[PDB]
Amino acid sequence: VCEFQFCNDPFLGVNCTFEYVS
Amino acid sequence: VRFPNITNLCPFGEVFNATRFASVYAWNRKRISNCVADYSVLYNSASFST
């Protein structure tokens, strides 16, 4: 839940209060 | 009285029993969140001067 900077059009290729990793 | 097992405790041991400490000018600020915080060790322990 970080104050993230996102791309104009986020995609995937082939200050934080909470963090969890499975 | 029944509650879930006291696990997922916050790591006060990484703060109080740290191998290295920062200066007062620029101290280390650790965020403690999403846990069970057991303060009985810190309160009852005789290792503390105050």
Ligand SMILES: *[C@@H]1O[C@H](CO)[C@@H](O)[C@H](O)[C@H]1NC(C)=O
């Ligand atoms: C984190 O939040 C504080 C308080 O709003 C702000 O001063 C600081 O610049 C922020 N840090 C980042 C990387 O955004």
Ligand SMILES: *[C@@H]1O[C@H](CO)[C@@H](O)[C@H](O)[C@H]1NC(C)=O
């Ligand atoms: C630090 O480690 C010692 C090991 O003897 C332990 O007794 C003490 O309670 C620990 N301190 C904290 C804050 O856990």
